[PDB]
Subunit: 145 residues, 2 copies
Protein backbone atom coordinates (compact mmCIF):
# COMPACT_ATOMS: atom_id res chain seq x y z
CA UNK A 1 0.00 0.00 0.00
CA UNK A 2 2.60 2.53 -1.18
CA UNK A 3 1.85 6.14 -2.08
CA UNK A 4 3.41 7.54 -5.24
CA UNK A 5 3.51 11.07 -6.62
CA UNK A 6 3.77 12.30 -10.17
CA UNK A 7 3.71 15.89 -11.37
CA UNK A 8 -0.05 15.85 -12.01
CA UNK A 9 -1.46 14.07 -8.94
CA UNK A 10 -1.05 11.58 -6.13
CA UNK A 11 -1.43 7.85 -6.61
CA UNK A 12 -2.68 5.49 -3.93
CA UNK A 13 -1.71 1.92 -4.88
CA UNK A 14 -3.65 -0.93 -3.26
CA UNK A 15 -3.03 -4.62 -4.24
CA UNK A 16 -5.91 -7.01 -4.95
CA UNK A 17 -5.66 -8.74 -1.54
CA UNK A 18 -6.47 -5.52 0.37
CA UNK A 19 -9.85 -5.08 -1.38
CA UNK A 20 -11.12 -8.33 -2.93
CA UNK A 21 -11.30 -12.05 -2.19
CA UNK A 22 -9.39 -12.79 -5.42
CA UNK A 23 -7.87 -10.98 -8.41
CA UNK A 24 -10.58 -12.16 -10.84
CA UNK A 25 -13.89 -10.89 -9.44
CA UNK A 26 -15.51 -7.70 -8.17
CA UNK A 27 -16.29 -9.53 -4.92
CA UNK A 28 -14.91 -7.76 -1.90
CA UNK A 29 -13.55 -9.11 1.39
CA UNK A 30 -14.05 -8.68 5.19
CA UNK A 31 -11.29 -6.18 6.02
CA UNK A 32 -12.45 -4.34 2.91
CA UNK A 33 -15.09 -2.18 4.58
CA UNK A 34 -12.76 -1.02 7.40
CA UNK A 35 -9.84 -0.19 5.07
CA UNK A 36 -11.88 1.61 2.38
CA UNK A 37 -13.57 3.47 5.20
CA UNK A 38 -10.17 4.61 6.42
CA UNK A 39 -9.33 5.83 2.91
CA UNK A 40 -12.79 7.41 2.68
CA UNK A 41 -12.18 9.31 5.94
CA UNK A 42 -8.88 10.53 4.58
CA UNK A 43 -10.41 11.65 1.29
CA UNK A 44 -12.98 13.54 3.33
CA UNK A 45 -10.04 15.54 4.69
CA UNK A 46 -9.16 17.02 1.27
CA UNK A 47 -10.26 20.26 -0.48
CA UNK A 48 -13.76 20.05 -1.97
CA UNK A 49 -12.27 20.58 -5.44
CA UNK A 50 -9.89 17.61 -5.50
CA UNK A 51 -10.98 14.97 -7.96
CA UNK A 52 -10.60 11.33 -7.14
CA UNK A 53 -10.47 8.78 -9.90
CA UNK A 54 -10.54 5.06 -9.09
CA UNK A 55 -8.68 3.07 -11.70
CA UNK A 56 -8.64 -0.74 -11.84
CA UNK A 57 -6.06 -3.01 -13.49
CA UNK A 58 -5.80 -6.78 -14.05
CA UNK A 59 -3.00 -9.25 -14.71
CA UNK A 60 -2.94 -10.97 -18.09
CA UNK A 61 -4.28 -14.15 -16.47
CA UNK A 62 -6.71 -16.05 -18.72
CA UNK A 63 -10.32 -15.48 -17.76
CA UNK A 64 -11.85 -18.87 -16.98
CA UNK A 65 -12.72 -19.51 -13.34
CA UNK A 66 -14.42 -16.08 -13.59
CA UNK A 67 -17.44 -14.60 -15.40
CA UNK A 68 -15.96 -11.61 -17.27
CA UNK A 69 -15.11 -11.52 -21.02
CA UNK A 70 -12.35 -8.87 -20.94
CA UNK A 71 -9.71 -7.68 -18.50
CA UNK A 72 -11.25 -4.26 -19.16
CA UNK A 73 -14.66 -5.41 -17.93
CA UNK A 74 -12.98 -6.99 -14.89
CA UNK A 75 -11.13 -3.74 -14.06
CA UNK A 76 -14.18 -1.52 -14.54
CA UNK A 77 -16.29 -3.49 -12.07
CA UNK A 78 -13.62 -3.78 -9.40
CA UNK A 79 -12.99 -0.03 -9.68
CA UNK A 80 -16.75 0.62 -9.78
CA UNK A 81 -17.22 -1.39 -6.64
CA UNK A 82 -14.48 0.45 -4.72
CA UNK A 83 -15.98 3.75 -5.89
CA UNK A 84 -19.34 2.69 -4.50
CA UNK A 85 -17.96 1.81 -1.11
CA UNK A 86 -16.11 5.12 -0.86
CA UNK A 87 -19.49 6.71 -1.41
CA UNK A 88 -21.42 4.46 1.06
CA UNK A 89 -18.86 5.79 3.53
CA UNK A 90 -19.53 9.48 2.78
CA UNK A 91 -17.43 10.65 -0.21
CA UNK A 92 -19.28 12.92 -2.64
CA UNK A 93 -20.22 11.31 -6.00
CA UNK A 94 -19.58 14.72 -7.61
CA UNK A 95 -15.92 14.30 -6.73
CA UNK A 96 -15.66 10.68 -7.80
CA UNK A 97 -15.22 8.67 -10.98
CA UNK A 98 -13.92 5.20 -11.90
CA UNK A 99 -11.71 3.68 -14.63
CA UNK A 100 -10.28 0.60 -16.28
CA UNK A 101 -6.88 0.00 -17.91
CA UNK A 102 -7.36 -3.70 -18.50
CA UNK A 103 -4.16 -5.68 -18.33
CA UNK A 104 -1.66 -3.68 -20.41
CA UNK A 105 -0.15 -1.57 -17.64
CA UNK A 106 1.60 -3.99 -15.25
CA UNK A 107 3.69 -2.93 -12.27
CA UNK A 108 6.10 -5.85 -12.61
CA UNK A 109 6.48 -9.45 -13.80
CA UNK A 110 3.57 -11.65 -12.84
CA UNK A 111 6.11 -14.18 -11.50
CA UNK A 112 5.26 -14.03 -7.79
CA UNK A 113 1.85 -13.77 -6.15
CA UNK A 114 2.92 -10.49 -4.50
CA UNK A 115 3.78 -8.96 -7.89
CA UNK A 116 0.62 -10.43 -9.41
CA UNK A 117 -1.44 -8.72 -6.65
CA UNK A 118 0.27 -5.51 -7.83
CA UNK A 119 -0.82 -6.02 -11.44
CA UNK A 120 -4.44 -6.51 -10.26
CA UNK A 121 -4.21 -3.52 -7.93
CA UNK A 122 -6.69 -0.75 -7.63
CA UNK A 123 -5.22 2.73 -8.00
CA UNK A 124 -6.81 5.77 -6.38
CA UNK A 125 -5.51 8.74 -8.36
CA UNK A 126 -6.12 12.21 -6.84
CA UNK A 127 -5.92 15.54 -8.71
CA UNK A 128 -7.80 18.67 -9.87
CA UNK A 129 -8.78 20.34 -13.14
CA UNK A 130 -6.38 23.32 -13.11
CA UNK A 131 -6.77 25.52 -16.14
CA UNK A 132 -5.08 28.81 -15.12
CA UNK A 133 -1.86 28.12 -17.02
CA UNK A 134 -4.13 27.32 -19.95
CA UNK A 135 -6.35 30.34 -19.18
CA UNK A 136 -3.21 32.51 -19.39
CA UNK A 137 -1.70 31.03 -22.56
CA UNK A 138 -5.04 31.58 -24.27
CA UNK A 139 -5.42 35.20 -23.27
CA UNK A 140 -1.86 35.88 -24.52
CA UNK A 141 -2.59 33.93 -27.72
CA UNK A 142 -5.44 36.15 -28.89
CA UNK A 143 -3.55 39.31 -28.06
CA UNK A 144 -0.08 38.47 -29.42
CA UNK A 145 -0.21 35.38 -31.65
CA UNK B 1 4.22 40.77 -36.46
CA UNK B 2 5.93 43.74 -34.77
CA UNK B 3 7.35 41.77 -31.82
CA UNK B 4 8.32 38.19 -30.93
CA UNK B 5 6.02 35.17 -30.54
CA UNK B 6 4.50 33.44 -27.51
CA UNK B 7 6.17 30.16 -26.55
CA UNK B 8 4.36 27.78 -24.21
CA UNK B 9 5.57 25.23 -21.67
CA UNK B 10 3.78 22.95 -19.15
CA UNK B 11 4.56 25.41 -16.27
CA UNK B 12 3.62 28.65 -18.10
CA UNK B 13 3.75 30.93 -21.10
CA UNK B 14 6.92 32.48 -22.52
CA UNK B 15 7.15 35.76 -24.38
CA UNK B 16 10.63 35.92 -25.94
CA UNK B 17 11.78 39.46 -26.77
CA UNK B 18 14.99 39.76 -28.81
CA UNK B 19 17.24 42.40 -27.26
CA UNK B 20 18.43 43.26 -30.76
CA UNK B 21 15.00 44.91 -31.06
CA UNK B 22 14.55 46.00 -27.44
CA UNK B 23 17.97 47.47 -26.73
CA UNK B 24 19.98 50.01 -28.72
CA UNK B 25 23.29 48.20 -29.03
CA UNK B 26 23.86 44.55 -28.08
CA UNK B 27 26.45 45.69 -25.51
CA UNK B 28 23.79 47.83 -23.76
CA UNK B 29 20.61 47.79 -21.71
CA UNK B 30 18.95 51.10 -22.70
CA UNK B 31 15.28 50.83 -23.74
CA UNK B 32 13.76 52.73 -26.68
CA UNK B 33 10.78 54.27 -28.53
CA UNK B 34 10.28 51.13 -30.67
CA UNK B 35 10.07 48.88 -27.58
CA UNK B 36 8.21 51.12 -25.05
CA UNK B 37 4.74 50.90 -26.60
CA UNK B 38 5.08 47.10 -26.81
CA UNK B 39 6.19 46.93 -23.18
CA UNK B 40 3.14 49.10 -22.49
CA UNK B 41 1.10 46.72 -24.62
CA UNK B 42 2.29 43.76 -22.52
CA UNK B 43 1.67 45.63 -19.31
CA UNK B 44 -2.08 45.85 -19.97
CA UNK B 45 -2.43 42.05 -20.30
CA UNK B 46 -0.58 41.49 -17.03
CA UNK B 47 -3.10 43.88 -15.51
CA UNK B 48 -6.13 42.02 -16.97
CA UNK B 49 -4.89 38.67 -15.65
CA UNK B 50 -5.89 37.18 -12.25
CA UNK B 51 -3.50 38.74 -9.76
CA UNK B 52 -2.45 35.21 -8.65
CA UNK B 53 -0.35 35.24 -11.82
CA UNK B 54 3.29 36.20 -11.41
CA UNK B 55 5.67 37.65 -14.01
CA UNK B 56 9.36 36.81 -14.15
CA UNK B 57 11.28 39.06 -16.57
CA UNK B 58 14.32 36.89 -17.49
CA UNK B 59 17.44 37.95 -19.51
CA UNK B 60 19.54 35.97 -22.00
CA UNK B 61 22.89 36.44 -23.75
CA UNK B 62 25.10 34.98 -26.53
CA UNK B 63 28.87 34.43 -26.20
CA UNK B 64 30.29 37.69 -27.59
CA UNK B 65 32.36 38.85 -24.53
CA UNK B 66 31.93 42.59 -25.36
CA UNK B 67 33.75 44.02 -22.32
CA UNK B 68 34.15 47.43 -23.99
CA UNK B 69 31.39 48.75 -21.69
CA UNK B 70 30.98 48.83 -17.91
CA UNK B 71 29.32 45.41 -17.68
CA UNK B 72 31.68 42.53 -16.82
CA UNK B 73 30.48 39.02 -17.72
CA UNK B 74 27.24 37.55 -19.22
CA UNK B 75 25.29 37.34 -15.95
CA UNK B 76 25.69 41.04 -15.12
CA UNK B 77 24.39 41.89 -18.63
CA UNK B 78 21.25 39.72 -18.37
CA UNK B 79 20.69 40.73 -14.79
CA UNK B 80 21.05 44.26 -16.00
CA UNK B 81 18.79 43.90 -19.07
CA UNK B 82 16.19 41.70 -17.35
CA UNK B 83 15.94 44.47 -14.72
CA UNK B 84 15.49 47.37 -17.11
CA UNK B 85 12.64 45.45 -18.79
CA UNK B 86 11.07 44.38 -15.50
CA UNK B 87 11.02 48.10 -14.56
CA UNK B 88 9.36 49.65 -17.59
CA UNK B 89 6.30 47.45 -16.92
CA UNK B 90 6.16 49.04 -13.42
CA UNK B 91 5.87 52.57 -14.89
CA UNK B 92 3.30 51.19 -17.37
CA UNK B 93 0.89 49.58 -14.92
CA UNK B 94 1.85 46.11 -13.74
CA UNK B 95 1.74 46.41 -9.96
CA UNK B 96 5.29 46.03 -8.53
CA UNK B 97 4.14 42.91 -6.66
CA UNK B 98 3.74 40.53 -9.58
CA UNK B 99 7.10 41.31 -11.20
CA UNK B 100 10.33 39.41 -10.68
CA UNK B 101 13.51 39.66 -12.78
CA UNK B 102 16.42 37.25 -13.38
CA UNK B 103 19.61 36.51 -15.31
CA UNK B 104 20.58 33.28 -17.08
CA UNK B 105 22.22 32.99 -34.93
CA UNK B 106 23.13 34.81 -31.70
CA UNK B 107 20.14 37.11 -32.31
CA UNK B 108 18.35 33.96 -31.18
CA UNK B 109 20.09 34.03 -27.79
CA UNK B 110 19.85 37.71 -26.93
CA UNK B 111 16.38 38.29 -25.55
CA UNK B 112 14.31 39.40 -22.57
CA UNK B 113 11.99 36.51 -21.82
CA UNK B 114 8.74 37.12 -20.00
CA UNK B 115 7.56 34.14 -18.06
CA UNK B 116 3.93 33.90 -17.02
CA UNK B 117 3.19 31.48 -14.21
CA UNK B 118 1.64 30.98 -10.77
CA UNK B 119 2.53 29.25 -7.52
CA UNK B 120 -0.25 26.62 -7.70
CA UNK B 121 0.46 24.31 -4.72
CA UNK B 122 -2.74 22.20 -4.56
CA UNK B 123 -1.16 18.99 -5.75
CA UNK B 124 1.52 19.61 -3.15
CA UNK B 125 -0.99 20.02 -0.36
CA UNK B 126 -2.77 16.86 -1.55
CA UNK B 127 0.47 14.89 -1.25
CA UNK B 128 1.29 16.69 1.94
CA UNK B 129 -1.92 15.32 3.40
CA UNK B 130 -1.81 11.78 1.97
CA UNK B 131 1.83 11.18 2.95
CA UNK B 132 0.82 11.50 6.61
CA UNK B 133 -2.07 9.11 7.08
CA UNK B 134 -0.36 6.27 5.19
CA UNK B 135 3.27 5.25 4.76
CA UNK B 136 5.33 3.90 7.70
Amino acid sequence: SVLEQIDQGSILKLPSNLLFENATSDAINQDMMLYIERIAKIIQKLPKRVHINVRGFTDDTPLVKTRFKSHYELAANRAYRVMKVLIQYGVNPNQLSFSSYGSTNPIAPNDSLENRMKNNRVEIFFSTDANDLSKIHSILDNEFN
